[PDB]
Amino acid sequence: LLTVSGGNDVYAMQFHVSLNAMTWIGRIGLIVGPAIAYFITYRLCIGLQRSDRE
Amino acid sequence: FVDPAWPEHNPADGHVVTELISKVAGASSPWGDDKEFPVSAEETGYVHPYTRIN
């Protein structure tokens, strides 16, 4: 997200997104992006463990 | 030439697979339709790996 925000002006134009919206996505996404990533990854790890036991 | 894995069938009043008919209701097994499962754990050649941590 930091890397994308670092080139968010080339993202904004080429993908037709508001540059202000991109800044806010970066700001908010740094809090809720990591949280969702943790949740999904944890559940998927346990899922892979379960399939391994079956 | 006939493939070794081709099911041993009489080439008289019987065909295993044609354009439109077959012997099963569904997809033919990719591990031989004439293969009897399950088999003994020895034939699989799976070696259960004893591991100890620390």
Binding site: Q14 | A25, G26, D33
Partner: protein
């Protein structure tokens, strides 16, 4: 599928009759609420709409000739008649999800009209389709 191959003749002949009525009625009738002349969308796509039903009907008809009396097609069949193997069903696979993701990438490629994105999406789709088919074929890992 003894009766399945037969019931398609219904829609086939119906649509074939409507398509010929349509062409002749549209090119020779002046209503005043429209103009005169054959319509080239309701004609081609209704002639060829009957084509689909005819194709499927004929294929199933040829197929059903050279099939024996199956227990599912037999009126008084015991449950123990089909006792055997119902062939091979895939238990699980990750590739459907991947190839949906691949078509999504190509989709956005076409939306934004980015050549690199279209090219990558096209070859990202070939790869996933290939892996779907070669799923149960991947050889035992040779050292």
């Amino acid at each position: 599928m003894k009766s399945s191959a037969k019931l398609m003749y219904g829609p086939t002949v119906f649509m074939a009759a409507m398509a010929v009525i349509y062409i002749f009625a549209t090119m020779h009738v002046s209503d005043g609420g429209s103009v005169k002349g054959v319509e080239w969308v309701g004609s081609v796509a209704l002639v060829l709409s009957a084509g689909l039903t005819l194709m499927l009907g004929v294929y199933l008809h040829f197929t059903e000739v050279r099939v024996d009396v199956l227990p599912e097609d037999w009126e008084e069949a015991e449950v123990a008649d089909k006792a055997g193997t119902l062939g091979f069903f895939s238990p699980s696979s990750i590739w459907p999800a991947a190839m949906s993701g691949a078509v999504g990438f190509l989709a956005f490629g076409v939306v934004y009209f980015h050549y690199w994105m279209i090219a990558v999406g096209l070859m990202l789709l070939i790869f996933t389709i290939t892996k779907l088919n070669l799923q149960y074929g991947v050889p035992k890992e040779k050292h």
